[PDB]
Design an enzyme around this catalytic site. Structure first.
Site, PDB file in Angstrom:
ATOM      1  N   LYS A   1       3.701 -10.275 -22.878  1.00 56.27           N
ATOM      2  CA  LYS A   1       4.061 -11.346 -23.806  1.00 56.27           C
ATOM      3  C   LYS A   1       2.843 -12.189 -24.169  1.00 56.27           C
ATOM      4  O   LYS A   1       2.620 -12.522 -25.343  1.00 56.27           O
ATOM      5  CB  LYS A   1       5.148 -12.217 -23.178  1.00 56.27           C
TER       6      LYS A   1
ATOM      7  N   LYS B   1      10.558  -9.311 -17.839  1.00 54.69           N
ATOM      8  CA  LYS B   1      11.648  -8.882 -16.968  1.00 54.69           C
ATOM      9  C   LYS B   1      12.981  -8.838 -17.710  1.00 54.69           C
ATOM     10  O   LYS B   1      13.773  -7.907 -17.516  1.00 54.69           O
ATOM     11  CB  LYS B   1      11.736  -9.812 -15.758  1.00 54.69           C
ATOM     12  N   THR B   2      13.242  -9.832 -18.561  1.00 52.39           N
ATOM     13  CA  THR B   2      14.508  -9.875 -19.286  1.00 52.39           C
ATOM     14  C   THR B   2      14.671  -8.661 -20.191  1.00 52.39           C
ATOM     15  O   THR B   2      15.761  -8.080 -20.274  1.00 52.39           O
ATOM     16  CB  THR B   2      14.597 -11.163 -20.104  1.00 52.39           C
TER      17      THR B   2
ATOM     18  N   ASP C   1      20.308 -14.283 -16.183  1.00 53.00           N
ATOM     19  CA  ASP C   1      18.883 -14.469 -16.413  1.00 53.00           C
ATOM     20  C   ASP C   1      18.471 -15.901 -16.104  1.00 53.00           C
ATOM     21  O   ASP C   1      19.256 -16.840 -16.259  1.00 53.00           O
ATOM     22  CB  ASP C   1      18.513 -14.137 -17.861  1.00 53.00           C
ATOM     23  N   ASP C   2      17.220 -16.054 -15.667  1.00 52.99           N
ATOM     24  CA  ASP C   2      16.623 -17.362 -15.415  1.00 52.99           C
ATOM     25  C   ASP C   2      17.454 -18.154 -14.403  1.00 52.99           C
ATOM     26  O   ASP C   2      18.017 -19.209 -14.699  1.00 52.99           O
ATOM     27  CB  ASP C   2      16.454 -18.139 -16.725  1.00 52.99           C
TER      28      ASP C   2
HETATM   29  N1  LIG Z   1       7.048  -2.386 -21.865  1.00 56.05           N
HETATM   30  C1  LIG Z   1       7.413  -3.648 -22.112  1.00 56.05           C
HETATM   31  N2  LIG Z   1       7.751  -4.437 -21.068  1.00 56.05           N
HETATM   32  C2  LIG Z   1       8.117  -5.699 -21.307  1.00 56.05           C
HETATM   33  N3  LIG Z   1       8.206  -6.336 -22.477  1.00 56.05           N
HETATM   34  C3  LIG Z   1       7.866  -5.534 -23.491  1.00 56.05           C
HETATM   35  C4  LIG Z   1       7.467  -4.210 -23.401  1.00 56.05           C
HETATM   36  N4  LIG Z   1       7.192  -3.694 -24.658  1.00 56.05           N
HETATM   37  C5  LIG Z   1       7.428  -4.701 -25.464  1.00 56.05           C
HETATM   38  N5  LIG Z   1       7.837  -5.844 -24.828  1.00 56.05           N
HETATM   39  C6  LIG Z   1       8.171  -7.116 -25.456  1.00 56.05           C
HETATM   40  O1  LIG Z   1       7.487  -8.122 -24.744  1.00 56.05           O
HETATM   41  C7  LIG Z   1       8.229  -9.362 -24.832  1.00 56.05           C
HETATM   42  C8  LIG Z   1       8.438  -9.845 -23.419  1.00 56.05           C
HETATM   43  O2  LIG Z   1       9.815  -9.670 -23.024  1.00 56.05           O
HETATM   44  P1  LIG Z   1      10.673 -10.879 -22.480  1.00 56.05           P
HETATM   45  O3  LIG Z   1      10.972 -11.864 -23.538  1.00 56.05           O
HETATM   46  O4  LIG Z   1      11.905 -10.303 -21.784  1.00 56.05           O
HETATM   47  O5  LIG Z   1       9.753 -11.507 -21.344  1.00 56.05           O
HETATM   48  P2  LIG Z   1       9.971 -12.304 -19.983  1.00 56.05           P
HETATM   49  O6  LIG Z   1       8.844 -12.120 -19.047  1.00 56.05           O
HETATM   50  O7  LIG Z   1      11.348 -11.912 -19.446  1.00 56.05           O
HETATM   51  O8  LIG Z   1      10.078 -13.806 -20.497  1.00 56.05           O
HETATM   52  P3  LIG Z   1      10.280 -15.285 -19.919  1.00 56.05           P
HETATM   53  O9  LIG Z   1       8.908 -15.666 -19.351  1.00 56.05           O
HETATM   54  O10 LIG Z   1      10.761 -16.205 -20.989  1.00 56.05           O
HETATM   55  O11 LIG Z   1      11.272 -15.114 -18.763  1.00 56.05           O
HETATM   56  C9  LIG Z   1       9.551  -8.985 -25.507  1.00 56.05           C
HETATM   57  O12 LIG Z   1       9.318  -9.126 -26.902  1.00 56.05           O
HETATM   58  C10 LIG Z   1       9.634  -7.479 -25.267  1.00 56.05           C
HETATM   59  O13 LIG Z   1      10.284  -6.932 -26.405  1.00 56.05           O
HETATM   60 MG   LIG Z   2      12.805 -14.257 -19.852  1.00 49.85          MG
END
Ligand SMILES: Nc1ncnc2c1ncn2[C@@H]1O[C@H](COP(=O)(O)OP(=O)(O)OP(=O)(O)O)[C@@H](O)[C@H]1O
Ligand SMILES: [Mg+2]
Ligand SMILES: Nc1ncnc2c1ncn2[C@@H]1O[C@H](COP(=O)(O)OP(=O)(O)O)[C@@H](O)[C@H]1O
EC number: 3.6.4.6
Lengths: 517, 102
Positions: free
Chosen positions: A485, A326-327, A380-381
């Site tokens: 991720k 999401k971030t 965020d968060d």
């Molecule tokens: N289409 C995509 N959607 C989401 N993330 C992607 C995508 N393509 C690549 N990524 C990569 O996947 C990883 C996940 O992104 P991110 O760190 O924002 O996850 P998150 O779910 O927000 O994390 P957290 O659980 O810490 O809140 C990042 O490295 C992002 O660059």
């Molecule tokens: Mg995050």
């Protein structure tokens, strides 16, 4: 209200008719009518004025025009550090006026003194006391005037603003679309008659585009555009033996304005920038429709908050299972916004901070965001920012109330804003009733089909044809539950084994993970 | 002389804290609860055209409505963004999604 009509365009002032008229009516009206009826009124001449606001908007030019038309001599100027032995310099400013009052004083002219950055020389109490004595001391100077300027009026000494002395204050703020249009109309005069510009030029588009632009930037636009065009066409015709006037035939300028605007001049006020690599490290890869849907919704929200009058504030919330990415999506949308002002507030910069310090940081960020005609702020968060914990509650009430109050406060007139939040514990937020503060919610699901997993693997490009077929046959069933991720780090781990014992290790790791919500 | 006016959204919680005794009287502001009122508000806002108004009236005259004014403004502004073909469909879908029991 009745007024004597002026010709602002002739004097070169545009977009400040109200301020000029009010200043002239309240300050300089008395000193133009003859002394006899002035005395019969009982009228008393004002002694000081104050102007404050952003830099470059043209505070000095207003008084310069009045002096040009004041039917008197020119005004003298002083600088903040020039005076800063001091009394000797002080005797170099009012000594001329004192000499005039020795030679005159009942029918003498008007002397004007100009102070720049006055706040720097008053808050050093000796100079403040000397100045206060001079403006209003035992002797009365009836042929002098003081016009101070600064940008931080809150830091000016109160005794200097006592009604007997300086009594008029005004604010000169940044221009608006119509003001920018008029300013450009004024500045585009010499080339208008010189026909050095192209007929296809549309000043309306230029005025619309420039959001945070002061008059100085507007004039620099013209300067840079003319320079670019002269160089362009002269150089184009110099390297060829074509007719010289061919270059002058391209003298007219249509696209050089945009060329100069690209990177030659940039806004000075506000205009913060952010890095997105730290928040988008692996880029964005499309593995299904949901990414496109989310991007389209974000684009629609960005569009609404720019051409709407009834909604000067918009907020949006993103929710989904942990590690759904999401971030990164929020950062991508913020970068795609293309707004002059952008900022990100994350708990990562807030480590070991006390609750009060966190509240101060949040309010400071929002206060800075308020200063720009456009902006976009990302938080965020939220659940972590509140310092939650499943074993009973431990939320910091103060941090919750700060957020809940902030999310609704609209900005001053004519300024817009957008707020985006990202969370994973939707139910907990719903319990605290803060969900209603937001306007809309967009979902961020997880991979739920095998074919999606194979598509993601092929986009990544790590497994070979035989391994791809093996995985496809093994997990053909569409009963997977995985985040991007988690998939990334799982592949990175699985790649560490020997070439032979890799596919089986990957399958074992996948089986260890869950397969349903 | 003096006059104090208050505003709140959680009446029961205030009731438990023994606060309504201080206040002398209370007034109730309701929400939109009929299709006719929604149609009147839409007409007064002057956003949609005649044909779309007829379509909306025809589709909305077979259900109940319970919505706040500010949310209605937000939905109208959001729906206006889409292309002219799907404005009515998007607005109706958002209204259905927001629809909830009183
Ligand atoms: N289409 C995509 N959607 C989401 N993330 C992607 C995508 N393509 C690549 N990524 C990569 O996947 C990883 C996940 O992104 P991110 O760190 O924002 O996850 P998150 O779910 O927000 O994390 P957290 O659980 O810490 O809140 C990042 O490295 C992002 O660059
Ligand atoms: Mg995050
Ligand atoms: N209303 C206006 N009319 C004409 N020029 C303006 C106006 N506002 C700003 N400017 C531009 O601003 C510049 C002058 O700013 P200046 O008086 O030096 O500000 P300050 O003295 O506060 O630093 C000029 O180049 C002028 O073209």
């Amino acid at each position: 209200i009745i007024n004597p009509d002026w010709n602002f365009e002739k004097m070169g002032i545009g977009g400040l008719d109200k301020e000029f008229s009010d200043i002239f009516r309240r300050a300089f009206a008395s000193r133009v009518f003859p002394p006899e009826i002035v005395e019969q009124m009982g009228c008393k001449h004002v002694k000081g004025i104050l102007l404050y606001g952003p830099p470059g908007c043209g505070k000095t030019l207003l008084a310069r025009q009045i002096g040009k038309m004041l039917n008197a001599r020119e005004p003298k100027v002083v600088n903040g550090p020039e005076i800063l032995e001091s009394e000797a310099n002080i005797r170099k400013l009012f000594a001329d006026a004192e000499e005039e009052q020795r030679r005159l004083g009942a029918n003498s002219g008007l002397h004007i003194i100009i102070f720049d950055e006055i706040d720097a020389i008053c808050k050093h109490d000796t100079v403040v006391n000397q100045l206060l004595s001079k403006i209003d001391g035992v002797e009365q100077l009836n042929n002098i005037l003081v016009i101070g300027m600064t940008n931080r009026p809150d830091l000016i000494d109160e005794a200097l603003l006592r009604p007997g002395r300086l009594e008029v204050k005004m604010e000169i703020g940044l221009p608006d679309e119509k003001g920018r249009l008029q300013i450009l109309h004024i500045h585009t005069a010499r080339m208008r008659g010189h026909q050095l510009l192209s007929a296809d030029v549309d000043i309306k588009e230029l005025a619309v585009e420039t959001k945070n632009f002061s008059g100085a930037e507007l004039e620099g636009l013209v300067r840079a555009a003319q320079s670019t065009a002269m160089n362009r066409h002269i150089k184009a015709s110099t390297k060829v033996e074509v007719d010289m006037e061919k270059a002058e035939s391209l003298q007219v300028t249509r696209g050089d304005f945009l060329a100069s605007l690209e990177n030659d001049i940039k806004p000075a006020f506000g205009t913060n920038q952010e890095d997105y690599a730290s928040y988008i490290m692996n880029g964005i890869i499309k593995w299904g429709d949901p990414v496109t849907r989310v991007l389209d919704d974000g684009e629609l929200l960005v569009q609404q908050t720019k051409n709407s009058d009834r909604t000067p504030l918009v907020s949006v919330l993103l929710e989904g299972p942990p590690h759904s990415g999401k971030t990164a999506l929020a950062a991508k949308i913020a970068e795609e916004s293309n707004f002059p002002f952008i900022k990100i507030c994350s708990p990562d910069k807030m480590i070991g901070f006390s609750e009060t310090a966190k509240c101060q940081a949040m309010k400071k960020i929002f206060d800075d965001a308020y200063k720009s005609q456009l902006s976009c702020v990302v938080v965020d968060d939220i659940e972590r920012l509140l310092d939650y914990v499943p074993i009973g509650p431990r939320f910091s009430n103060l941090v919750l109330q700060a957020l809940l109050v902030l999310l609704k406060k609209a900005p001053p007139q004519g300024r817009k804003l957008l707020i985006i939040g990202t969370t994973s514990r939707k139910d907990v937020l719903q319990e605290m009733e803060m969900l209603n503060a937001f306007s809309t919610t967009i979902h961020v699901p997880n991979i739920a089909t095998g074919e999606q997993l194979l598509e993601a693997l092929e986009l990544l490009g790590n497994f070979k044809d035989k391994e791809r077929t093996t995985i496809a046959q093994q997990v053909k069933g569409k009963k997977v539950w995985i985040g991007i991720k988690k998939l990334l780090m799982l592949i990175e781990m699985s790649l560490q084994m020997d070439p032979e014992y890799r596919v089986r290790k990957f399958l074992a790791l996948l089986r260890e993970e869950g397969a349903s919500p």
